[PDB]
Amino acid sequence: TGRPEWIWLALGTALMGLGALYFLVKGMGVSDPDAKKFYAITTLVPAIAFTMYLSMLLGYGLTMVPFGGEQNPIYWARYADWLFTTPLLLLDLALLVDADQGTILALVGADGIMIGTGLVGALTKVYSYRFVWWAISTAAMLYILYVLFFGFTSKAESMRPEVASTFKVLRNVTVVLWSAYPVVWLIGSEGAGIVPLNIETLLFMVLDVSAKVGFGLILLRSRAIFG
Numbered sequence: 001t002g003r004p005e006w007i008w009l010a011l012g013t014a015l016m017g018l019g020a021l022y023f024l025v026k027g028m029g030v031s032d033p034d035a036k037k038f039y040a041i042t043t044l045v046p047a048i049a050f051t052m053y054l055s056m057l058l059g060y061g062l063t064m065v066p067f068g069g070e071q072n073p074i075y076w077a078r079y080a081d082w083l084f085t086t087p088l089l090l091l092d093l094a095l096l097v098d099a100d101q102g103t104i105l106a107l108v109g110a111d112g113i114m115i116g117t118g119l120v121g122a123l124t125k126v127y128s129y130r131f132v133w134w135a136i137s138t139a140a141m142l143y144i145l146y147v148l149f150f151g152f153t154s155k156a157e158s159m160r161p162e163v164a165s166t167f168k169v170l171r172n173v174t175v176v177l178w179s180a181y182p183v184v185w186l187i188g189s190e191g192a193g194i195v196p197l198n199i200e201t202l203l204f205m206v207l208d209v210s211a212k213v214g215f216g217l218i219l220l221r222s223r224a225i226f227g
């Protein structure tokens with residue numbers, strides 16, 4: 001096939017794999033129970049991303065959805081990735097500030113809605129309705145971000161500055177990166193079709209890698225993960 005976006009898919013696969021292995025190696029050397037916890041969660045994130053990037057690289061996770069008078073290429077494998085990686089990242093943040101079970105449940109649920117409606121919208125055949133689903137998915141993301149900024153930050157204040165400071169950074173990277181996804185979707189292949197798929201794939205790999213390996217590197221190198 002040789003689609004123009006394959007190089008970005010290859011680069012995404014490469015970076016997710018390397019990040020996974022490094023986390024795995026670093027994770028199985030640590031003896032601390034809590035640290036192990038964070039390591040297992042944070043290693044799984046890029047591990048899942050790797051498998052999906054690899055699949056997409058190999059020609060799977062791609063479907064032609066008709067709308068706008070065109071046969072649009074929609075990479076659905078992405079949602080198969082995010083469905084499990086986004087809530088896991090959320091869990092990492094939750095465990096960090098000792099969030100309550102109710103909060104976590106609500107965050108993971110909002111996250112499920114976000115990815116769920118997101119895919120439904122990415123698959124919808126009525127052009128205008130694609131944006132209705134997109135709209136609901138974004139509303140869910142804003143809820144998650146609101147909670148992370150207003151809820152979590154507040155509880156991270158019962159933690160040690162080292163932990164509060166680590167969370168702030170992770171929270172910040174998350175707010176900035178996550179905020180970008182809906183915009184990429186809106187102007188890319190799933191939306192307005194303004195930004196071409198190859199470029200679109202590039203933007204997604206940068207955000208994905210930053211949000212997983214970037215996030216992991218920051219979290220795992222901190223002393224805040226220790227019991």
Ligand SMILES: *C/C=C(C)/C=C/C=C(C)/C=C/C1=C(C)CCCC1(C)C
Nearest residue numbers: 118137138141178181182185208211
């Ligand atoms: C490793 C992957 C990460 C951190 C992915 C984050 C993804 C989002 C915040 C995605 C958000 C979306 C919307 C707000 C609406 C349209 C569809 C999505 C799923 C692209």
